[PDB]
Ligand SMILES: Nc1ncnc2c1ncn2[C@@H]1O[C@H](COP(=O)(O)OP(=O)(O)O)[C@@H](O)[C@H]1O
């Protein structure tokens with residue numbers, strides 16, 4: 001019984017390690033943008049839209 | 053270098069580098085040409101908006117999915133989708149990265165061969181490998197046995213696996229999936245007055261289905277309750293106002309999964325094809341499959357499905373066996389997480405289909421030892 | 424040093440060091456290669472599970488016994504079984520231990536010669552000796568006379584012995600044994616609806632036979648009773664549920680021993696081959712053989728056989744002689760206990776086949792004086 005429990009736990013732990021290795025590996029892909037605002041109180045362009 | 057774990061899917065393309073937790077870029081797989089004439093000059097109007105860009109200009113486009121049921125029906129559009137995925141959503145040239153596509157079970161050979169031929173000739177990858185979408189979902193759960201029901205958006209397939217030895221004679225592939233549920237919901241909404249017809253409004257009906265529908269624990273009791281009280285009627289605001297109220301359409305749309313006779317399909321529901329898939333297995337591994345039933349895929353995210361399915365299987369199965377349904381919270385990306393884990397393994401590093409091998413045997417190499 | 428008392432048997436390999444009461448490691452002798460494909464990578468899947476490991480993964484294996492009827496039909500598998508027995512179940516290298524194998528009577532010579540050649544060349548033991556499986560069972564009873572019926576799982580043989588002098592002309596070897604009873608039980612279970620076909624389900628039928636079957640004291644009365652009442656129907660739970668109910672199959676399976684016409688064999692039952700074996704002996708030692716009839720082997724463990732056999736022999740034998748049937752509770756391991764006793768004797772210490780002797784005369788040494 002102890003041997004069976006040990007082998008089952010070993011297999012489960014090995015699978016969990018294989019998963020968790022890549023789980024911790026590339027977890028920085030969550031870096032994205034937040035798109036805050038600044039009120040753009042300094043835009044003083046001219047009316048020359050020809051490019052559309 | 054790092055491997056690219058792409059996952060074509062049907063409805064959402066999920067991609068990202070191997071070894072992370074979540075796909076880097078997830079976006080619908082639709083390519084929509086404009087349909088009106090266009091009068092402004094120099095506006096910079098393109099001829100086809102793909103990916104998430106065509107979900108914002110969908111008011112004047114005709115979106116059309118390039119993947120119908122697992123299989124790919126329009127190869128030019130699929131090539132366009134892949135090109136977008138590589139160059140704009142990941143910005144990594146494919147000349148320096150292995151790729152790991154995914155494919156549903158029991159699909160036509162020509163689809164897989166054309167996929168590998170494209171990946172090797174057009175994008176010119178170093179090496180690509182095609183894997184069955186259910187084995188990955190079993191990887192992600194950290195198990196090594198279990199019968200996985202991967203109800204995607206294109207096709208629902210049910211692959212049983214024991215001790216790492218897949219049982220090829222017990223795969224039950226059924227073509228009811230999220231898209232048919234969207235169409236059926238769009239068809240039963242007409243019973244209150246709301247008519248959605250345009251291919252753009254299918255997206256609105258999909259959003260309604262995602263946000264409101266749920267799977268009833270017992271169907272007849274819910275049908276009786278919704279017909280007397282009004283505690284179920286949840287309202288939803290269209291993209292222009294004019295809120296709508298969904299009554300007993302809420303649990304009737306996803307009920308089609310357990311009674312495919314609603315949309316005229318003959319076959320049995322996802323509650324009985326799993327039991328049939330188990331009973332085809334050998335008599336000595338049925339207990340383990342009963343105890344390790346795995347759910348995956350997007351469509352299995354309905355609130356309350358992990359209880360309805362367990363109740364149904366417990367009704368069907370012998371009374372002594374314990375029925376357990378594994379429903380991880382990261383169900384939607386389970387296949388891609390498993391793909392990342394598989395691509396990150398050292399033992400797997402020599403199974404890729406190297407380009408010189410393809411040059412020697414042609415595209416039919418995929419059916420050979422390098423599966 | 425200590426001697427290794429191995430006992431190949433057919434169905435259960437029993438081994439252990441000489442001088443103990445019970446074998447150290449008892450495990451089925453089956454070697455099963457996997458038969459499905461296998462999709463998980465790096466799971467550490469071996470190419471052949473032997474011994475008790477293949478009774479737990481039997482759901483995806485094709486178990487095949489390497490010993491059919493006493494004789495060995497597949498030498499590579501038998502070598503694998505021996506290697507497992509030495510290295511993993513006892514963990515003693517064979518380079519430092521004498522071995523005492525056991526062999527059924529009247530077996531082919533080539534089997535014995537190949538056995539000794541393997542033990543001397545591959546495992547490289549210091550000295551090995553082969554003994555007849557019935558003399559050991561007579562040792563274990565502490566007798567020195569008596570006729571022993573050793574109904575194993577492969578072959579049933581009946582060796583009479585008097586005052587230590589074996590009678591070679593009175594050995595009656597019959598090839599009906601536990602395996603044929605398992606097959607016949609599996610064949611008569613089909614009369615209720617239960618079909619077991621796979622080589623893995625033969626193990627389930629064997630478990631049914633062990634736990635439920637019993638030998639009827641009188642066959643016709645039991646057949647009449649089981650056909651009217653229902654006091655015999657005992658139920659049993661399969662490895663997945665769906666309990667089964669065994670009716671008059673309970674005492675019909677082991678009845679084949681006393682009527683081998685059930686499985687189409689011509690010969691007479693184990694109740695009449697013992698009487699024939701006695702009658703071939705001399706007229707002056709028949710009383711002692713009548714009084715000291717010994718039972719051994721696994722298959723003689725059926726509840727109620729020591730009474731049926733005594734009734735049958737008393738019917739056959741003359742009315743004056745006393746018929747007594749010795750049925751020790753440690754029947755299954757009787758041969759191995761006797762083997763331990765024989766290996767522990769000082770007088771026996773010079774009968775081993777020393778390696779230098781084998782080097783001088785070749786494998787044919789076993790038929791010579793060192794028997
Ligand atoms: N939260 C949700 N609730 C209900 N249904 C959902 C949810 N998310 C996605 N779906 C359905 O699942 C589909 C996406 O499935 P997905 O797993 O992306 O398919 P694929 O296997 O092609 O990647 C969508 O079309 C949608 O109908």
Ligand SMILES: Nc1ncnc2c1ncn2[C@@H]1O[C@H](COP(=O)(O)OP(=O)(O)O)[C@@H](O)[C@H]1O
Nearest residue numbers: 432433434435575576601633720721722724725
């Ligand atoms: N308790 C039991 N009741 C009935 N039959 C048994 C029992 N134990 C073992 N057997 C039968 O005896 C066989 C084992 O016999 P065994 O003495 O191990 O053979 P061997 O002589 O090869 O060692 C098994 O195959 C089984 O069919």
Ligand SMILES: [Mg+2]
Nearest residue numbers: 061204349387
């Ligand atoms: Mg999918």
Ligand SMILES: [Mg+2]
Nearest residue numbers: 432575720758
């Ligand atoms: Mg024996």
